Amino acid sequence: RQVIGLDIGTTSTIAILVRLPDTVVAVASRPTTLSSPHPGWAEEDPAQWWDNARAVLAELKTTAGESDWRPGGICVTGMLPAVVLLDDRGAVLRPSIQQSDGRCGDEVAELRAEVDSEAFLARTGNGVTQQLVTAKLRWIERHEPAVFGAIATVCGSYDYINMLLTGERVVDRNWALEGGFIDLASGTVEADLVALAHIPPSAVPPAHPTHRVLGAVTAEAAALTGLPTGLPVYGGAADHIASALAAGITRPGDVLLKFGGAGDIIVASATAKSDPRLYLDYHLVPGLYAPNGCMAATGSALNWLAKLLAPEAGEAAHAQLDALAAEVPAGADGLVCLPYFLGEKDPFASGTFTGLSLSHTRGHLWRALLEAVALAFRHHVAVLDDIGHAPQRFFASDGGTRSRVWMGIMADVLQRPVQLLANPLGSAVGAAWVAAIGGGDDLGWDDVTALVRTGEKITPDPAKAEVYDRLYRDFSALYATLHPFFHR
Fold it and tell me: With contact defined as beta carbons under 8 Å apart, do 7 and 427 qualify?
């Protein structure tokens, strides 16, 4: 029994064909262009998503061949919240504004001055930020009133592709929630909330939950994509959440730790409870929420430091530095690092190394950074705990998992077992799974992990709890001490 996931990614459009329960029959990809017409702008062409999607779906069929082509449902995921504008005829008004876009600081300031940023965050479980569809909408109204006045539909990237597939008009709950349109209490688009963006409430399509069938592939879209006519299409899926699912975050208390360029932490919870510190999403798993967080400098901060410390080491840099840090005690001999090189995610704090002496070596520096990143991950976990999400079962994925030293450090700091895994194909897998569970009940959400490369489960050394606890206390006190100085 066969199923497809499609991922409308930021620099890449990826589709996979899975034969259940545990086989990836085919993978297709295509590059996507991130434009920036002015500094801090991040835009994409929704017509390239669609062209990418047609190519990659058709290639799936061409790769697997007709004799192994029997797809039974498709789910589309991608980045969010992207802002796509359609006029009354369904045509794209201007290029899509991506979530990394930075053009709307002024409107964020107004929004923040015009509503209670806490009441708001308690309401939508997301903060008043440039990532709100609402902030980008206010910017457009003031900078491109003609675009603004022509808006019949505002939606996200994968919502747009789904419309092209089914002719339905909806958005993912999660696009609307991250976007600022949904009240957690009601789980629906609120007039109230749309009004803030000064668009008519008709301009935002009804929200739709990922796990439910959204519609079927139309005749036009069968033609353009190769997909069978009438193929069931599921709700669109938020990319980072589908990634959490694929990593096996399916039960309340499950936590994913993503050692990417920027770090993420994603947790499944029965508790919906916004917090100034952590953003909220619905899980794909019905009934669950997915509080999540991001840290700006993670693998990026290591790449920076590896270049400084192993200038002409090439790729071996990390391997070489990992080895040095290995020979260095936990806590790095009194080194304490704050890892906020782009800021953190509150203020504009900055990277700090302290406790340095002429005895420290490149290994201590590398280690201190390794430990600091771990420590920031710990802090999130403590926050999750505080809010009542009860973090307990831990997974790590992405690039940093290739470092046995880093992961040993992570576990010793967290003082819980950490299950390492590889999930290279990414979010597309979380998406195939949604359609997998919709086309029968021979499978649980649970079962996704047959599709990923689960690896070593690392146990902490309990004798390290006492040093990392004190380091944690130091890290915390370093930041509290340097706060006033950072906001001088």
Answer: yes
Q: Which residue has the tokens 């409430």?
A: 201
Cβ-contact 199, 136 below 8 angstroms: no
Burial of 444 (0-12, 13-18, 19+ CB in 10 A): exposed
DSSP 445: G
Phi, psi of 330 (to 5 degrees): -45, 130
104, 33 Cβ separation under 8 angstroms: no
Closest by CA to 474, choosing from 344, 378, 348, is 378
Q: Among residues 289, 188, 286, 184, which one has the least CA distance to residue 235?
A: 286
- The span from the CA of 429 to the CA of 423, in Å, is 9
- DSSP track, 109-167: HHHHHHS-HHHHHHHHSS-SSTTSHHHHHHHHHHH-HHHHHT-SEEE-HHHHHHHHHH-
Do residues 468 and 331 touch, judged by C-beta distance below 8 A?
yes
Burial of 31 (0-12, 13-18, 19+ CB in 10 A): exposed
Domains of the chain: 1-238 (3.30.420.40), 239-488 (3.30.420.40)
Place of tokens 């070596």: 361
CA distance 342 to 297: 6
Rounded Cα distance between 402 and 399, Å, is 6
Count of residues making up the chain: 488
Cα(first)–Cα(last) distance of the chain, in Å?
A: 61
Please, which experimental method was used? X-ray
Per-residue tokens: 234: 């599921």
**Gap between the Cα atoms of 211 and 297, Å rounded:** 33
Cβ-Cβ contacts under 8 Å for 466 (sequence gap 6 or more): none
Q: Residue type for 117, please?
A: S
Q: Resolution of this entry in Å?
A: 2.3
